[PDB]
Structures are given as C-alpha cells and as structure tokens.
C-alpha cells in the first residue's frame, strides 16, 4: 500500500487535482508497473525531487525538469490520468471514461457522449463562459 499511496500522492501533485479515484489509480499503477518494471523507484525519485526542491505545484516541477530523465514518466502519469489510457494503440486498455480528467474541464457545458446531461432538451440554454474553469 506504500506504492499505491506514493503513486496517488504524486498523481494528485502532477495532475493538480486532489480528488482522484483510488480504484482507477490502483489499476493505473498495476498497468504502469507491468509496462515498466522500475516504475516505483522512478515515482520515489520524483517525490524526492519534489520534497527536496520544495515545488509548490506541477508547473514549477515541469519547468525545472524539462530535461531530467524523470520528465517522460511524469508526463506519462499526467497523460494516463487525463486520457484514461497508457498506450497509443487502437487496442490500448481504457482505465477511465467519464472520470478521466480531460472530460472534466468542459463537463458543465459539453456532454460526455454516452452519458446524458440533464434532460432531453437541455441544450436550449446558453452555455457558460470559457473563462470560468468549473470545478475539480
């Protein structure tokens, strides 16, 4: 559970959103460890970097890690949390849909297709401003 806890903490730091599903996180960690055998040590190294350099947000960590070899795995973690996939094929396993973080920034306006917004004619109303980030 130490590996899962470290992965979830580093994920909450990397995506910038505290509320992350623990089942999705566990499945993502299992898939990441199956794909890369040394994923846990890289997670620990990234967390050590964060704690030692006292990075406030993922913006500063990304800015100060643009060439260090731990950048690809951090970007991969962010991509897996937002997209819901880890690979790049048409048969890649999907670990999150409708809970993936890339459908959240537009959830107040845009439908996540196979799930309904409120009501059979909701779209007669005017949409929200693009400058107001909803939630999450």
């Amino acid at each position: 559970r130490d590996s899962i806890s470290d992965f979830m903490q580093l994920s909450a730091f990397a995506t910038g959103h505290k509320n992350l599903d623990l089942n999705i996180g566990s499945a993502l960690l299992l898939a990441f460890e199956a794909q890369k055998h040394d994923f846990s040590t890289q997670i620990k190294a990234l967390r050590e970097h964060i704690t030692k350099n006292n990075y406030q947000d993922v913006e500063a960590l990304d800015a100060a890690m643009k060439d260090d070899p731990l950048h690809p795995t951090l970007i991969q973690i962010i991509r897996a949390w937002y997209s819901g996939v880890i690979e790049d094929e048409t048969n890649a396993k999907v670990y999150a849909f409708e809970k993936a973080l890339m459908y959240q920034p537009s959830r107040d306006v845009v439908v996540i297709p196979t799930y309904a917004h409120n009501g059979p004619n909701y779209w007669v109303s005017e949409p929200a401003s693009v400058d107001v980030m909803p939630a999450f």
Partner: peptide
C-alpha cells in the same frame, strides 16, 4: 463498476 474490468469484454 470498473472501467478496466470491461476491457476483456471488448
């Protein structure tokens, strides 16, 4: 439910 567990059912 689990989205991951559905991958085997594609």
């Amino acid at each position: 439910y689990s989205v991951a567990n559905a991958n085997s059912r594609r």
